[PDB]
PDB file of C-alpha atoms (C1' of nucleotides) in Angstrom:
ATOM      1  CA  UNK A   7     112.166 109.119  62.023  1.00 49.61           C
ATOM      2  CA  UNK A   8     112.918 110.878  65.629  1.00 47.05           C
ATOM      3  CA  UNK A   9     113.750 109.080  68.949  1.00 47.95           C
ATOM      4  CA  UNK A  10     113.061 110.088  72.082  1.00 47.91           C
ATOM      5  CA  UNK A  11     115.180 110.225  75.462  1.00 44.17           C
ATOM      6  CA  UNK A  12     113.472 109.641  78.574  1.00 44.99           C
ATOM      7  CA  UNK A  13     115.226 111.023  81.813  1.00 45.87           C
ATOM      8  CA  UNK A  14     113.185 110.232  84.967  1.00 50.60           C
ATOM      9  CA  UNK A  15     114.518 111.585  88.147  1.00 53.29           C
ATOM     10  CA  UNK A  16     112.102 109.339  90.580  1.00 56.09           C
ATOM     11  CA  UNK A  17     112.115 105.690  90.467  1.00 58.89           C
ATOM     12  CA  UNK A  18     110.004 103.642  88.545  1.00 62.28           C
ATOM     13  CA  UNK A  19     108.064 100.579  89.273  1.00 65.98           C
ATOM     14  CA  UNK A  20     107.534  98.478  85.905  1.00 65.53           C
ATOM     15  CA  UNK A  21     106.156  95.249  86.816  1.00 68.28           C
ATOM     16  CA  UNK A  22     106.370  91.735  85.023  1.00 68.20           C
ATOM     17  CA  UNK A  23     103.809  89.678  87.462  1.00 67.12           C
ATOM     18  CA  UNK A  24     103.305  91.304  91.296  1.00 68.35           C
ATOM     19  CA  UNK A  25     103.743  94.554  92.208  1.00 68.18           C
ATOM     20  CA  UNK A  26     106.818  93.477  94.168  1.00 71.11           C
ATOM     21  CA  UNK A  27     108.478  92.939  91.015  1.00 69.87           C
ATOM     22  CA  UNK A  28     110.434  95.352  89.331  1.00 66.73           C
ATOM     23  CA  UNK A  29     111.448  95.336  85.487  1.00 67.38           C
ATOM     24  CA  UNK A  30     114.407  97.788  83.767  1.00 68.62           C
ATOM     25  CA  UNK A  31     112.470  98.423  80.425  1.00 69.21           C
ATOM     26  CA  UNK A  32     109.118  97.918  78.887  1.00 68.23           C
ATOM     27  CA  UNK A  33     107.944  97.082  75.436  1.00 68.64           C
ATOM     28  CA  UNK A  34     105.393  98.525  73.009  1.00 68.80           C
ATOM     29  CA  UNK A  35     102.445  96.964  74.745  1.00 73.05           C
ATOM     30  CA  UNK A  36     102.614  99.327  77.734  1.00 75.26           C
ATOM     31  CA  UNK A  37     103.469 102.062  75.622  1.00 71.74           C
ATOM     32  CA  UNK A  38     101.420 102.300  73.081  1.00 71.49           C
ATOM     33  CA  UNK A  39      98.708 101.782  75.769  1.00 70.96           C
ATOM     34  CA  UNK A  40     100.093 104.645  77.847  1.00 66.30           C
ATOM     35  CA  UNK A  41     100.087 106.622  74.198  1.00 66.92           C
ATOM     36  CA  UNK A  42      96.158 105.793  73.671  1.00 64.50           C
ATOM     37  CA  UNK A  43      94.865 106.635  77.312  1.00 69.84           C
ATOM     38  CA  UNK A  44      96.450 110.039  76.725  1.00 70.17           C
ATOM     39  CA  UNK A  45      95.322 110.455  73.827  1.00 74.14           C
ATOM     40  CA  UNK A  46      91.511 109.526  75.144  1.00 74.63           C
ATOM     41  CA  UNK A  47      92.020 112.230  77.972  1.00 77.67           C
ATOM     42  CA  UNK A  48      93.247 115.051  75.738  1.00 80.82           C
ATOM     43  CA  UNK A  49      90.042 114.029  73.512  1.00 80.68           C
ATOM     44  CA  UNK A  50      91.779 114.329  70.650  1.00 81.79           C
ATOM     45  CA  UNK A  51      91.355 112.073  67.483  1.00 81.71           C
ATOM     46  CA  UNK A  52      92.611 108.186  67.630  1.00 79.17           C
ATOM     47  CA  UNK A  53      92.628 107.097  64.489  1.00 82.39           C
ATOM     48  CA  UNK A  54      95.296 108.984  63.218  1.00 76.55           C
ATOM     49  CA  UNK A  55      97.536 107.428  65.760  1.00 72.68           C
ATOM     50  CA  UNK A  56      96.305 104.186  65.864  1.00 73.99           C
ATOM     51  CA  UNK A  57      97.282 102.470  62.237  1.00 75.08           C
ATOM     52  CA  UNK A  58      99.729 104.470  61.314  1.00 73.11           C
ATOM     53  CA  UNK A  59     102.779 104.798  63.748  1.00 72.59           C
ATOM     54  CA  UNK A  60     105.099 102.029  64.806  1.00 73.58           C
ATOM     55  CA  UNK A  61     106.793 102.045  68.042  1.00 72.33           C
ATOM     56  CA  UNK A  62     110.036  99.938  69.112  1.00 72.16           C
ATOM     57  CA  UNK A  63     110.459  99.125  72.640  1.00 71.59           C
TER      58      UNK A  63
ATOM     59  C1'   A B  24      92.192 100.697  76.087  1.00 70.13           C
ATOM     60  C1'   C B  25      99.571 100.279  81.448  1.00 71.29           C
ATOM     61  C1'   G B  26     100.027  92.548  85.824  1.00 72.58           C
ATOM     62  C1'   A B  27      96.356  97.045  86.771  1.00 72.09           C
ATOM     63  C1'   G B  28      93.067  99.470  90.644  1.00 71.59           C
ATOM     64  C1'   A B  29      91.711 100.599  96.353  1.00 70.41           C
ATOM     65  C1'   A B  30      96.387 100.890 100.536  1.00 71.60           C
ATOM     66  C1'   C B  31      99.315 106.686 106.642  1.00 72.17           C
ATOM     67  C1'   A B  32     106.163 100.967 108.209  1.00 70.71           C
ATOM     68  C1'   C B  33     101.242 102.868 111.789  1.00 69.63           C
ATOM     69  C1'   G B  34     100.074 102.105 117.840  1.00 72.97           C
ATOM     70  C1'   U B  35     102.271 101.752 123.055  1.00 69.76           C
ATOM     71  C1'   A B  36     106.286 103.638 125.919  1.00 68.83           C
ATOM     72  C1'   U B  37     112.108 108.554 127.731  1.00 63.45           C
ATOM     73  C1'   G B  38     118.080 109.266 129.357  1.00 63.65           C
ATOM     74  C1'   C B  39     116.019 107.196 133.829  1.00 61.39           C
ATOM     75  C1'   C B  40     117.918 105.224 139.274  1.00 64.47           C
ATOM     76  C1'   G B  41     121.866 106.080 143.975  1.00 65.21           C
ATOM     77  C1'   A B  42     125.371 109.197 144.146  1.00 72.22           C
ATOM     78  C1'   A B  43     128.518 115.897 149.432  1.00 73.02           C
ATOM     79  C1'   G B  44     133.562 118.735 145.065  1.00 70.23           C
ATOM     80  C1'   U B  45     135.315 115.883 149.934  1.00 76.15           C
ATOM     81  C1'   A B  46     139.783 114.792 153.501  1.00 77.10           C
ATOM     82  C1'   U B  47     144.195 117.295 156.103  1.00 79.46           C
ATOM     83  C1'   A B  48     145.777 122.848 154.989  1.00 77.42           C
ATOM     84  C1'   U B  49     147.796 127.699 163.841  1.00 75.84           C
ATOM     85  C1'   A B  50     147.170 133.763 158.802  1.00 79.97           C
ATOM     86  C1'   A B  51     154.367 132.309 160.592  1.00 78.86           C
ATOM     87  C1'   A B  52     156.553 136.742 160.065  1.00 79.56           C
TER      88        A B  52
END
RNA sequence: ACGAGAACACGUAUGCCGAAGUAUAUAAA
């Protein structure tokens, strides 16, 4: 049970409704989306990572 | 399998214009 730190170093655009909104932090939904689209470019396997890992925002 | 994806804060125009470094100032002894 790891966490992760995320330093960025350029400035972010997050987005709640319009892209001239701007939001601090996301949740799972946009992460575990970002997780599974780079997973499908790698090629590697999703099921592995699909029902078995839980993610907090 | 991200309220996404396309997307040059771009284009036009300058330090310009009139101005004298002048006026007196026995090269005495």
């Amino acid at each position: 049970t790891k966490v992760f730190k995320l330093s960025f170093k350029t400035p972010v655009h997050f987005g709640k409704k319009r892209l001239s909104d701007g939001e601090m932090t996301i949740t799972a939904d946009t992460l575990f989306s970002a997780l599974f689209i780079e997973t499908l470019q790698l090629g590697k396997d999703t099921d592995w990572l699909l029902n078995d890992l839980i993610i907090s925002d």
